[PDB]
């Protein structure tokens, strides 16, 4: 997966510069989600790419769902 | 019980009536004539003695 | 409808008796206070007690000195008044040696503190900042009450000696070789543009030009390398996009005879000041210019 | 002798109780159109100038040129209302939603209330009432003209959800103390004419004044004296990101172009910042010293 | 100043003798001799300067504004701004309310330094005309 990992850094990076910007109704809440979208990483093992994937997609759902005002 | 001893230090605030003792003519109070300097707010105008 | 009446001069304030002698002479009765005269009765300049922490009353036991207001997030306090000396250790203009000497005599949390709040945010100091006028008469304690001049002559109660205004030697620079008999003077921030940081330019312009005009132009001489430096940082760094070269605002005016050089003394350290001596003030406001 | 001040009355009769309202308002700005003395009621304050169709800059264009009294005592029949001096101290009352600081430059804008009810009414009379600016302080009045200017732009386009959030925020200052959201200029689908004639006005000269620029600047760069007319023109092309492995380096020109129609062009750029010098420039008016205890009364030396 | 350069001298003499001329407030007025200088040169000069600065300080969307109004909207105003302006919905390609407010607040500054140039500090304000016209009182001395 290392070749699709290190785009997976840049999507996930892009996503930190509309994040700021976007309006909310909480801006205070969606920027603790903006906070832990910047600090993944990959540990050398394997096997803790997939636990970092659900810290980082569960966080960004829950900011994409608010830009329809998801529920 | 830990090992570790413990030494609380409380400070304890008393109302004191304090009695005030001195000796006649034990000081000079030399004063000049009080004076009214007069400030400017816009609508009342405040003085001070 | 009296002619008698429009024919009249006008009756001086002062040849009428007090306002307070006027309620008295009806009574006829004399309190101990001496209503006989009214200090301060006479000030076309207007003036404001401000109270002060005293870990910023270095070089302010001087009379005559800038009053700013700082505001800075938190509620307390709300604001802060910074001298023009305490904030010339974030000036560029100032020497190396200079910035050294009166930064160690600023040895305070409440002074240090302000070198921090200029820190913390990306936003620039000019709009930060609010000339009030002038130190006249301070309190010196423990929270020191400067009084302030917000228009007209600093000068000592009942005009028994006029105080000068007092500018580091270093923020002074001049234009024109040949002063005019009057000039007025001017605060003017110009900030050149860097990499980490838009360090501050400080700087006390005083000129006999006053129209607007004129006045911006003769300055784009001397500061053009600024300018230089900041079309460059705009054309550098898109989605970021700082504003204006420098900050021009009226401080007040000078009879340009007054200037010369002086020091001032405190704490055993004597530090050379351009001093200004019958400074009328007349504060405007900052005019944004590239 | 009597302080000089205008003289004014009401051709309504008034109530005692309406007469103690007038009370709070005796340390207050009143704007008065023109400078006289005798003056009508219907005259008096802003709200001979409320309009429909007109939005808010109407107000503002001309309240520029009115001239501020304060009140200063009401004689029943009559009311006195000096006009204040530059130079000289004048109290004022805090009808501006903002408490004052010591120190703050105020300065006058006319009254934007919102949706829900707040402190508004006080004096109905004769299908009639007395509205008054708001008095702000200054670094807040730069922020609020450019709030209505920003949403004007996004009045063509209420259709999507991004721009119908992000308008939302504009519309919610966010400042010290209390906040006070301001209204929307938007309504029946389409912007009023006056925000239409200012977001025109910036509109011109956001896009005009790029391709007229270019005749110029190209001649005066020989010159080479500052050497930021070099500089200058890649600032013309207006990119983001640098320019890819393709055409064109030089900006963007007028090609041909009639010798009498360019110079239209010229005079139509400038004419536009005219409409729009009432927002370019705002003016203190006021500048307050010592304040009064909960923020209610002030010391302002007067300016303008 | 602006149309002298970059220009047949022939050309300009048809602008020049015109330009100079205004029929403000009815009656005709007439500049005696205006002439290119190096006293309008550094007035040109600040003037490329600045006004081009503004070309890279309105948004995407605000310089669309136009184009956006016409494909909707249409008026006696805008049809003159049709033929001034170049020959030849929609998502907006972004919004971001804090960029917004920075990116108006630095035009700002552009335009209250550019105005200024045409613009003269008042010298007076007129109250009261006499009917004689030939006095008035003001206001805001210089």
Not at chain 4, 102 to 115: E, R, W
Request: proline residues 4%; aromatic residues 8%; contains cysteine.
């Amino acid at each position: 997966l290392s070749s699709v990992l290190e785009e997976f850094e840049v999507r996930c990076v892009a996503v930190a510069r509309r994040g700021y910007t976007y309006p909310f109704g909480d801006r205070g809440k969606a920027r603790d989600h903006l906070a832990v979208l910047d600090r993944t990483e990959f540990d050398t093992d394997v096997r803790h790419d997939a636990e970092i994937v659900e810290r980082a997609l569960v966080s960004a759902v829950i900011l994409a769902k608010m830009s329809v005002r998801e529920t | 019980h830990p090992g570790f001893a413990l030494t609380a230090v409380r400070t304890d605030t008393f109302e004191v009536d304090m009695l005030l003792y001195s000796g006649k003519s034990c000081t000079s109070v030399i004063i000049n004539n009080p004076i009214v300097t007069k400030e400017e707010r816009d609508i009342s105008t405040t003085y001070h003695v | 409808m009296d002619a008698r009446a429009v024919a009249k001069r006008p009756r001086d304030p002062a040849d009428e008796d007090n306002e307070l002698v006027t309620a008295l002479k009806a009574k006829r009765e004399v309190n101990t206070i001496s209503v006989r005269y009214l200090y301060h009765a006479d000030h076309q300049a207007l003036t404001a007690r401000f109270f002060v922490p005293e870990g910023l009353v270095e070089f302010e036991a001087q009379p005559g000195a800038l009053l700013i207001r700082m505001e800075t997030g938190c509620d307390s306090p709300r604001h802060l008044y910074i001298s023009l000396y305490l904030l010339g250790i974030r000036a560029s203009n100032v020497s190396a040696s200079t910035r050294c000497l009166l930064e160690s005599v600023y040895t305070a949390s409440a002074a240090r503190a302000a070198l921090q709040w200029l820190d913390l945010g990306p936003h620039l100091l000019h709009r930060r900042l609010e000339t009030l006028g002038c130190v006249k008469t301070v309190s010196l304690g423990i929270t020191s009450l400067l009084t302030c001049v917000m228009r007209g002559y600093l000068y000592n109660t009942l005009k028994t000696e006029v105080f000068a205004l007092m500018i580091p030697k270093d923020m002074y620079l001049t234009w024109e070789e040949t002063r005019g008999r009057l000039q007025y003077v001017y605060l003017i921030i110009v900030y050149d543009y860097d990499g980490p940081e838009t360090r501050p330019g400080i700087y006390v312009l005083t000129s006999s030009i006053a129209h607007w005009q004129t006045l911006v132009d003769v300055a784009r001489g001397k500061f053009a390398r600024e300018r230089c430096s900041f079309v460059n940082r705009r054309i550098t760094r898109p989605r970021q996009i700082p504003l204006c070269t420098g900050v021009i605002q009226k401080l007040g005016w000078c009879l340009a005879d007054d200037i010369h050089t002086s020091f001032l003394v405190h704490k055993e350290l004597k530090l050379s000041v351009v001093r200004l001596d019958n400074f009328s003030v007349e504060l405007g406001d900052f005019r944004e210019f590239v | 002798a009597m302080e000089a001040n205008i003289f004014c009355t009401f051709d309504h009769k008034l109530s005692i109780a309406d007469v103690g309202k007038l009370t709070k308002l005796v340390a207050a700005v009143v704007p008065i159109p023109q400078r006289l003395h005798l003056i009508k009621h219907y005259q008096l304050g802003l709200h001979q100038f409320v309009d429909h169709t007109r939005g808010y800059v109407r107000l503002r264009g001309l309240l520029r040129n009115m001239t501020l009294t304060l009140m200063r005592r009401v004689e029943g029949n009559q009311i006195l209302l000096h006009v204040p001096t530059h130079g000289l101290l004048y109290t004022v009352l805090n009808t501006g939603p903002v408490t004052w600081e010591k120190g703050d430059a105020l300065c006058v804008l006319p009254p934007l209330f919102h949706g829900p009810l707040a402190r508004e009414n006080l004096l109905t009379l004769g299908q009639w009432e007395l509205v008054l600016p708001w008095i702000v302080p200054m670094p807040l009045a730069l922020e609020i003209n450019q709030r209505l200017l920003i949403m004007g732009l996004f009045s063509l386009d209420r259709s999507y959800e991004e721009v119908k959030a992000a308008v939302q925020q504009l519309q919610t200052i966010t400042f010290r103390d209390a906040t006070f959201t301001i209204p929307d200029p938007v309504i029946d689908q389409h912007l009023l004419i006056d925000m239409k004639t200012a977001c025109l006005s910036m509109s011109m000269v956001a896009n005009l004044a790029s391709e007229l620029t270019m005749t110029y600047v190209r001649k005066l760069a020989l010159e080479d004296s500052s050497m930021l007319l070099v500089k200058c023109q890649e600032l013309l092309m207006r990119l983001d990101r640098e320019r890819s492995v393709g055409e064109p380096r030089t900006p963007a020109r007028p090609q041909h172009v009639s010798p009498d129609d360019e110079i239209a062009r010229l005079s139509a750029l400038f004419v536009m910042l005219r409409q729009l010098d009432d927002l370019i420039r705002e003016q203190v008016v006021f500048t307050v010293c010592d304040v009064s205890p909960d923020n209610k009364s002030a010391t302002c030396i007067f300016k303008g």
